[PDB]
Design a protein around this ligand. Sequence first.
Ligand code: HEM
Ligand SMILES: CCCCc1ccc(N/C=N\O)c(C)c1
Length: 482
Amino acid sequence: AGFLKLLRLLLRRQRLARAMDSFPGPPTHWLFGHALEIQKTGSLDKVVTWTQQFPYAHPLWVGQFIGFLNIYEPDYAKAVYSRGDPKAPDVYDFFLQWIGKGLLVLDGPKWFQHRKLLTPGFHYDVLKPYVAIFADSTRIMLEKWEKKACEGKSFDIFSDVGHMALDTLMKCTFGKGDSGLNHRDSSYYVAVSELTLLMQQRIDSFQYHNDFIYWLTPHGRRFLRACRAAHDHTDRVIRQRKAALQDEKEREKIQNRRHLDFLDILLDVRGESGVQLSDTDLRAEVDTFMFEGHDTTTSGISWFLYCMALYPEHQQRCREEVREILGDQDSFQWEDLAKMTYLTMCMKECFRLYPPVPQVYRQLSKPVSFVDGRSLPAGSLISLHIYALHRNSDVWPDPEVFDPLRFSPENSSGRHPYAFIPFSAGPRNCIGQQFAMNEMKVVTALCLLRFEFSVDPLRLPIKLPQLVLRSKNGIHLYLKPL
Ligand code: HEM
Ligand SMILES: CCCCc1ccc(N/C=N\O)c(C)c1
């Protein structure tokens, strides 16, 4: 009985280890594989030095039973991430208790169904009205920030940006009305923190990899408590909207619109979806999009404002660009976001050096041959290291240098299409990319018009992976009103 399970395990690792025989790599500890380096602070930068020692790719082991091929070169990236192979179950299985089998984790033709269902929810006609909402939520955040700034001390902006991103996500895509944040929404935010802290730690800690053992550890119990808290939040948001649509005034109003917001699509009002969702399939897409359409943009906004603080020259250039575009308008219009070409460049360079998602994974369903002759069989595990990809010395002159002009029209024409993929690429790219970009542009444009941002030399951020890219100590900045 149990004997089979242990043998199925030991065969898999000789399979994975032999398929990577073509690929030299760093030294393994006998028990931990590479885990003792990965768990060290700064390990993203350690992986970068590895990519210079080993071109294209190198193996990566958490504790001797699971072995990934870390990849970080554009042809290698493209060979795999253009194909739609499944997400790595060893990594993505951990998601299930929390966000379930929603879009992120699915892989079948069921994935294509949901992707087809949900993609019109991020069409630009659905997005145009969100610009006003981004502005309102940002205004609330900035009024808080104005009070903190005139106290003269630096403070962590990450959490305030998150509360704002969560509120705006819910007003846009989950039907929440103008009421704004409630103490129960903050409960949810805190729980996401615990979920991503713990699940990242689980990814890196091979002893927690087996389901049965993990749910008996304090770690796993803490995770399940947070999963309940996340589910109490999403059950509420679902019941709230179903009930709001029982009102005859609101229900007729939604039908009139050609374009439906994301939660209303899932609820299949108008019968148009033609695909019937289980109660749990819908709970999972809500869980999924409630993690995804806000934790990442919080990382992005916050690392950007840090990059503005580090580089006042570019900060001031962006401040001037957005000042002219707004002119005398009350608030930015959707049409205005395309004019923000220099803000966009700086934002792209921010995402090169501080990718909001630094690492994603796949398990191949078919073999793949790489531009240099090497190859892998089906069954093998891939680790796309977006962090080291964006820092690759054969692709990026002076990789550690912040230079927005790398994303001018001129210096972009030649560039390889898989060199810069912070929203991934291929069939499993980010469904929310244009949502994020428009949100982040409105938020940061308004931030720079109302404050000048300085770093704090005594508390510079330190990089911390937590599924999204966070900081060990927050993002502490000084703010000057204007
Ligand atoms: C949900 C969701 C997906 C899955 C879409 C699908 O599978 O069809 C998605 C994908 C990605 C990926 C790939 C994930 C992987 O390889 O495991 C990356 C790297 C990424 C990065 C960012 N996303 Fe995203 N994303 C989903 C949802 C959202 C939403 C939802 C409203 C927004 C907004 C958004 C934004 C960003 C983002 C912004 C800074 C980054 C980076 N994503 N997504
Ligand atoms: C398995 C480690 C990374 C998994 C992962 C994949 C996608 C997202 N987000 C995508 N858009 O928001 C996050 C936040 C994480």
